[PDB]
Design a protein around this nucleic acid. Structure first.
Ligand SMILES: [Mg+2]
Ligand SMILES: [Mg+2]
Ligand SMILES: [Mg+2]
Ligand SMILES: [Mg+2]
Lengths: 118, 102, 100, 57, 233
RNA sequence: CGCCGUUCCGAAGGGACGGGCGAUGGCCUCCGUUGCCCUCAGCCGAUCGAAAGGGAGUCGGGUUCAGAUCCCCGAAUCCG
RNA sequence: CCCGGUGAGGCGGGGGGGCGAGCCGGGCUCUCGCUUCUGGCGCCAAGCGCCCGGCCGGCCGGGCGCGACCCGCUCCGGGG
């Protein structure tokens, strides 16, 4: 095996994988960003009631650490309603308002009638 | 008394050179086997004006005798150099203008 | 045996020990400033200073620059009474061995 | 177009169909094919005139 | 039958003619620091004037005497870890219903029995890392009249015992049958180490310049020898 | 305490195609996976530094008491 | 110990090849070892030798040496 290049580069050795003899923490920490903690309450303001009535949307005060993906997949769990799109914004109050726009056939005004806000 | 202006030059931070728009250190080609026992031929790609320097620089372009690659080098341009000219370097190089030899 | 290496390491002005201490010092001058040694260079002096050849005992070799302690102050200007104008010829109160 | 727009266009919109197409002008293409054939030709002439000298001498 | 297509295409590896081939450069490599360090400490051990006390470790046992030596030093190896237990068991059932002569290992024991004159032959490893551990043993053997010999390799001296490395080994006693081989070795050893101790204590090693710089002097000397060889007529 | 230093006293690449061996999941056909060698590999220095530098890709109309190239409608567009 | 350079890339001897001074096909002094008309291309092997591996001397597919002289103790130099 001749040295073709004048640069001795470090040879690559073998690298094993962690086979621990005991897990550090005993139990996996439960997911504290539950489908319920991710949606606190709705809004009943005529700035969102015109969205419900006209734009066929809903306005939730979601957790601030929530993605539009977690929101979509958690309204499709708490309310079983397919979602058109989600538009979030953090208020000066600090909470994250979220405008969820329902699929064409699903009626916001008629799922807010169900869940209580009307 | 205040550190005089002459003394304030050794620290720097104001008196450093303005090496922003400069094209690189104008240095000769390193010595290799070719340059040590024969001659190596390169061409002159261009002659540029380096800022903050009265002389012009010349991009001389050889080809690596060991790899497949075209090496660039920044010489200082002797007078009479033109573009597309051939510059030879090494021990067996002939003796004309721009022809670095021992 | 150990008293042979002991009485040998006292003739540092001899030929063999001035060759050994010099090839050692040359090789040490090429390594890092603080590096772990594989085994005690002086096994006798190490026993005398408490080194049992068992697991857990480690030997680090370390080099330190000789000379006094120049005072860390501006150019000259140690603002004070002429008593404390000394910077150059000062000495440190802890040995270079304690600094190692 | 801008550099990052080139991922949109098709290869025919980016090169002309010729040797060294869209990376060298035609004049300097022909004026390089010429110099190539001519230099290799003179290298052949000199190769001949080498053993022509070695034959007598 | 030859095919007129398979042309022969030779390359010209002249200056500037064609790219040099993937040659061998194990000489010009930039090595790691530890490699270059030990490679030029082996050179400092050729440039520096080595005192005879350290130089007396290069004159070592040959390759033919070594074989027979380890042949005799294989019948007297210490017991293993398992043989120690199986001897505690055979001693147990011995109680229910002499120590053989063996080798002897370690400097602290070899020196302490060379002073007691108990040894009959001492083998010393030629490459002890800090040489101070065996710098004195040569002279203590010569002084006590004990037949010592230097063997090449403390990693082959360390296979006699069942450890990684050993430093010295001592034959105190041997069985009847092997006393003849021991007397056929002690002769060829004492005539090679103890007899010539005067000329071993005087022989400085090292002090030899590198060939690149001894040829630059042998050339100049050659020019000035062929000067008087050619100017006389 | 730390400071100097940014390619300088360094074994500084954990990557890729192909091949051989080995395992795996399924139209176990044929691709994909990861384990081991073989082959190949330059670089130039971790990282940070611009809401005015570089930087693919959205426009019209409607709408609020306060938001619109962001919401509604209608037309597009980039990247994967 | 210091300095400069480089992806520490052909260093020192020895051998092998050609030109000229010479003695009468054989030993020495020498030197060279392949690039100067042009703004082109130039790697990732041709070739010869040796072996092996599957299907039927014939298809298929691998490896080793030469090509690309041998031997060496500092990477080369410059200081010291
Ligand atoms: Mg671990
Ligand atoms: Mg710093
Ligand atoms: Mg950044
Ligand atoms: Mg910007």
């Amino acid at each position: 095996k001749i040295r073709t290049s004048p640069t001795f580069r470090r040879p690559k050795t073998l690298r094993l994988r962690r086979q621990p003899k005991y897990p550090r923490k005993s139990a996996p920490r439960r997911n504290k960003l539950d489908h319920y903690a991710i949606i606190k309450f709705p809004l009943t303001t005529e700035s969102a009631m015109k969205k419900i009535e006209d734009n066929n949307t809903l306005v939730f005060i979601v957790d601030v650490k929530a993605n539009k993906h977690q929101i979509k997949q958690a309204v499709k769990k708490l309310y079983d309603i397919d979602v058109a799109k989600v538009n979030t914004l953090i208020r000066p109050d600090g909470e994250k308002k979220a405008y969820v726009r329902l699929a064409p056939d699903y009626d916001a005004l008629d799922v807010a009638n169900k869940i209580g806000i009307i | 008394g205040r550190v005089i202006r002459g003394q304030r030059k050794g620290a720097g931070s104001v008196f450093r050179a303005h090496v922003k728009h400069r094209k690189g250190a104008a240095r000769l080609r390193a010595v290799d086997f070719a340059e040590r026992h024969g001659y190596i031929k390169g061409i002159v790609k261009d002659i540029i004006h380096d800022p903050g320097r009265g002389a012009p620089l010349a991009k001389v372009v050889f080809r690596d005798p060991y790899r497949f690659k075209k090496r660039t080098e920044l010489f200082i341009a002797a007078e009479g150099i033109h573009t597309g000219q051939f510059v030879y370097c090494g021990k067996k190089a002939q003796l004309n203008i721009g022809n670095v030899l021992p | 045996g150990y008293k042979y290496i002991q009485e040998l390491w006292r003739k540092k002005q001899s030929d063999v020990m001035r060759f050994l201490l010099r090839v050692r010092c040359w090789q040490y001058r090429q390594l890092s400033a603080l590096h772990r040694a594989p085994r005690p260079t002086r096994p006798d002096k190490a026993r005398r200073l408490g080194y049992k050849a068992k697991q857990g005992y480690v030997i680090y070799r370390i080099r330190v620059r000789r000379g006094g302690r120049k005072r860390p102050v501006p150019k000259g200007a140690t603002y004070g009474k002429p008593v404390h104008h000394g910077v150059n010829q000062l000495k440190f109160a802890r040995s270079l061995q304690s600094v190692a | 177009v801008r550099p990052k727009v080139l991922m949109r266009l098709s290869k025919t919109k980016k090169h002309v169909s010729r040797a060294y197409g869209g990376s060298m002008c035609a004049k300097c293409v022909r004026d390089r094919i010429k110099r190539a054939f001519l230099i290799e030709e003179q290298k052949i002439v000199v190769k001949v005139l080498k053993a022509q000298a070695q034959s007598q001498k | 039958v030859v095919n007129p297509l398979f042309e022969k295409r030779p390359k010209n590896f002249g200056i500037g003619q064609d790219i040099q081939p993937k040659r061998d450069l194990t000489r010009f490599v930039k090595w790691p620091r530890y490699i270059r360090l030990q490679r030029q400490r082996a050179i400092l051990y050729k440039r520096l004037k080595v005192p005879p006390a350290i130089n007396q470790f290069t004159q070592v046992l040959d390759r033919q005497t070594a074989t027979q030596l380890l042949k005799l030093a294989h019948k007297y190896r210490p017991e293993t870890k398992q043989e120690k237990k199986q001897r505690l068991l055979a001693r147990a059932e011995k109680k229910a219903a002499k120590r053989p002569p063996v080798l002897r290992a370690g400097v602290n024991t070899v020196t302490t029995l060379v002073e007691n004159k108990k040894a009959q032959l001492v083998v010393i490893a030629h490459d002890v890392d800090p040489i101070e551990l065996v710098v004195f043993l040569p002279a203590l053997c010569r002084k006590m009249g004990v037949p010592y010999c230097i063997l090449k390799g403390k990693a082959r001296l360390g296979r006699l015992v069942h450890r990684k490395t050993c430093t010295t080994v001592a034959f105190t006693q041997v069985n009847s049958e092997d006393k003849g081989a021991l007397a056929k070795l002690v002769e060829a050893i004492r005539t090679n180490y103890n007899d010539r101790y005067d000329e071993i204590r005087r022989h400085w090693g090292g002090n030899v310049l590198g060939p690149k710089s001894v040829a630059r002097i042998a050339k100049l000397e050659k020019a000035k020898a062929k000067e008087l060889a050619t100017k006389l007529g």
